Design a protein around this ligand. Structure first.
Ligand code: HEM
Ligand code: HEM
Lengths: 145, 145
């Protein structure tokens, strides 16, 4: 239940999401591409889904990948801005869920993003505490897949 | 090319885009829904394209329409943030262009958004100069369609 999942976002979780986002969200192009490349590097079996982006091993040099990455960061920006209103958070989450449901992405495979997120956060000096906070936001999306 | 259209946006145009977005963009849910509803009111022929959103006459009450509207405003947020780097603006514009190319939206049909934009701008007292500034940003997307 996406609604029960959203209720898991307590005051402490929301604060950690915001604090960490202020830092990582300041460089959407850099951190966005880092997130994606890390995903492809640690989970090669997911690369097939991104056929449209071309050669993802080119990283920042790949225009399609860069465009994709930046846009992805704005989806997270959307989520963060909706934290005060669970009804609005839910409707945007379900909107992006659809984009993945059509791509045949399951809740389990969507969860493979948690590894990359922890690594990107770690490189910015944010530990498990912040990684666990984001796992909870990711869980809201998973509940809608 | 799309780059040509992007690279043309002058300092004065970027200024009007940013000043108007500061206001309109501060209420993404309210202004995004008004933009969509205005499009359906003045161009009823486009209603058919949004069948996934259900009953669009429901306005704010329609969760799917609300989620779509908020998300559309973040695509604009994305554009606004990439203004000083044509290379990044282009790759994100092309990304969203694919989203519409897939729905068989022509450059002409996409330009229908200009009327609604003008009205939303006017409701906040932003005149023709600002509407023309936005028509120029829309043209960047049209160059990709
Ligand atoms: C932090 C979590 C994630 C967010 C916020 C996110 C966001 C997005 C966004 C905004 C798009 C563009 C939607 C569209 O225009 O159709 C997208 C596309 C896509 N996503 Fe995700 N995504 C996430 C995780 C994942 C994961 C883990 C997978 C794969 C295991 C995945 C697979 C896809 C695929 C296949 C596409 C289509 C790419 C294309 O053809 O352009 N996403 N995602
Ligand atoms: C300022 C201009 C506009 C922007 C920034 C914009 C942005 C967006 C975004 C972000 C999506 C979601 C893409 C996806 O997840 O697949 C979308 C979908 C769509 N757009 Fe636009 N759009 C604009 C104007 C228009 C206009 C004028 C039309 C056609 C008359 C149009 C028709 C569509 C359709 C049919 C969809 C699919 C909706 C669905 O089934 O979910 N768009 N647009």
């Amino acid at each position: 239940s996406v609604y029960d999942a959203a209720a898991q976002l307590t005051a402490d979780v929301k604060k950690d999401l915001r604090d960490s986002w202020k830092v990582i969200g300041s460089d959407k192009k850099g951190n966005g591409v880092a997130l994606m490349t890390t995903l492809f590097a640690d989970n090669q079996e997911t690369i097939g889904y991104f056929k449209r982006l071309g050669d993802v091993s080119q990283g920042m040099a790949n225009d399609k990948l860069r465009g994709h990455s930046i846009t992805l960061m704005y989806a997270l920006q959307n989520f963060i801005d909706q934290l005060d209103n669970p009804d609005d958070l839910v409707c945007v989450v379900e909107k992006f869920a659809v984009n993945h449901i059509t791509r045949k992405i399951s809740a389990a495979e969507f969860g493979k993003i948690n590894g990359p997120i922890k690594k990107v956060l770690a490189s910015k000096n944010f530990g498990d505490k912040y990684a666990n906070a984001w796992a909870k936001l990711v869980a809201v999306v998973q509940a809608a897949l």
